[PDB]
Each structure stands twice: as C-alpha cells, then as structure tokens.
Amino acid sequence: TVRKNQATLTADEKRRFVAAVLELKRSGRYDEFVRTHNEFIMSDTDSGERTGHRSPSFLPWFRRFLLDFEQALQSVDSSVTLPYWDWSADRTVRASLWAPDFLGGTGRSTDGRVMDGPFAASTGNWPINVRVDSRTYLRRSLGGSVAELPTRAEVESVLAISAYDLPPYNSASEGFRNHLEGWRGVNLHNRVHVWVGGQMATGVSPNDPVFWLHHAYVDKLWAEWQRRHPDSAYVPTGGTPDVVDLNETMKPWNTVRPADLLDHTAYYTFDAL
C-alpha cells in the first residue's frame, strides 16, 4: 500500500479514487465516518476525556481512522489508496486538486456552493446528510476565512520540535503534537480546515473528501517527525487521567493502542519520506 501525493496521481488513479468514494457515499457507509468524527469532536474537551482531538492521541487516532477509511475504499476498489495533500506546496486554488476531474473547486460567493467536480450538489451524487448547518450541498470558500495555507518553512519549524507532546496534553500544550494540530504556534492542521471553509471548517468536516487528503498529509508529517526525532516517542506513557497513554486502548475501536500505530510501515508506505 503506497500513499501518494495527490498531485502525482494519474488520470486513472483519480477516476478510481473518486468512484470508490462515491460508492461509499451511495452505500451509506461514508456518512458514518462523518458521524464518528463529529461525535469525537463534540466530546473531546481540554478539561476531561479527550481522544480524537486536542490530545496526544490526535495523531494515532487519525491514523487508525484513516486506515478504517482506506480499507473501506479498498473494499470497493482494491487498487485505491488514500492520497495526501501537501498544502505547503499546493497552496493555491489552481492546484490540480481542485480541478473538476478530482475534487472540484471553490464555492460560489453567494452561498458557498461548490459548482463543479464529482462532489457538486448538482451531480445528485453527494448529498450532505450528516450536518449542523441545515444546507445539504457541499460548500467551500478556499482562502476565504484565512489568507494563506502554511508554508514549507512553517512546517519545518514545527517538525523541528523535539518533544512529542507535553503536559497538560491538551490545546494549551507546547510540543510537536499541539503545534501540528494547530492550537498553538503558527498553526498547521487547524488553519487548513479554516482555509478550505464550508463543511471542512465544522465538526462535520469529513463531508468534504479533501478531509482525508488533509489528514493523510498530517499523518505523513508525523512520520517525518519520527524520522527526524528517533529518540523521541509518544507520550504520555502510563497512568494519565483523561488522556490515552501509549499502551492504553482508544475509542471507538477499543482494541488498538497508540503503541500499535506508531510504525506506519506496518500498514503502508509513502511515495516519498
């Protein structure tokens, strides 16, 4: 299994990826991923139990969540893998990512509606069902709520941080995880959500297929961090209230620990690391 930079996909790879995602939608399986994410997002809190966001397990949790998604894709087309979006390189609305043969572009300025691509409401193929905003069409406003995606240099500064995470292991933490997540510092992952806009800025952000490519790149950055800091490892390592320790199991699967997800090469490799 090789996860590739989206920008390098062949036409056929794009076609099969799109088709696989659209079948997961049609069959009802896609929306349950949306719902799972929204639940963690509404439940994870800085002062209490926190698993999927704002905590050290943000990165292994998303790695397993993406694995779940990737295996569902492969159940439809076994040749499909999750591509990643390097938003530090492909940072304008003209990137091929946003072409009508892949994810489609930005929303119109009146109502944010995406009007092209396979996930446009007008296709009849991408109803927004799991939602808080009652509108049922995919929306985006690329670069609307924040002027720029993170730069390579900004990613580099985050990758330079040696400590995986640090007490109090939440949105107030110093350390790599919180800088990557974006709650402190120049802001990587959170800012990308804000930049895309539409459902991607909300708790029901997996409504936009770009969600998976974003997190696949976030996941790649953790892999790079580990290669930069082989002496650094997941923390905390035992007995921490409200937080998933290294060998503790994580909801909602209950059967896998951060420890089982540290080494991505047990599940996949990248085109380049």
Binding site: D46, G112, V132, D133, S145, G182, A201, V204
Partner: protein
Amino acid sequence: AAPESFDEVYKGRRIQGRPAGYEVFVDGVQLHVMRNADGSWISVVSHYDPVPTPRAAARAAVDELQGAPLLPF
C-alpha cells in the same frame, strides 16, 4: 468562572448565550459550543477557529450559516 449571558439580534438572527458549562442558541436552536484551555471558544460550525468569547462564537455561527436554519444536535 463562566462568561456573562448575552442576547442580541445579529445579522437579523437572535443569538443568546447563558451559563449552564455554557449554552448558546441561534433563533432558539441550541448551538454546541466549547471552551478551550486558554479561554477561547469554538462552535461546532467553526470548530478549528478559536474566538475570544461565546458571543463571538455565536456571531461566527450566524456568519457561517448565511441565513440557513441551524439543525439541533
């Protein structure tokens, strides 16, 4: 130590907040909101964009909604 309550019409919609640990409503429909460790707030429709106060989060929700009804949670 919770923020004060509020009530205003913002961009033609009624936004209300009140200590509960805090509740926000948009035209009578409750909006999930959350406080971050540093005192900032987010809402489910702006979950990755902290703002300083629950009123700011309610206003950010009205901005996001562009007039559409909010669905309950």
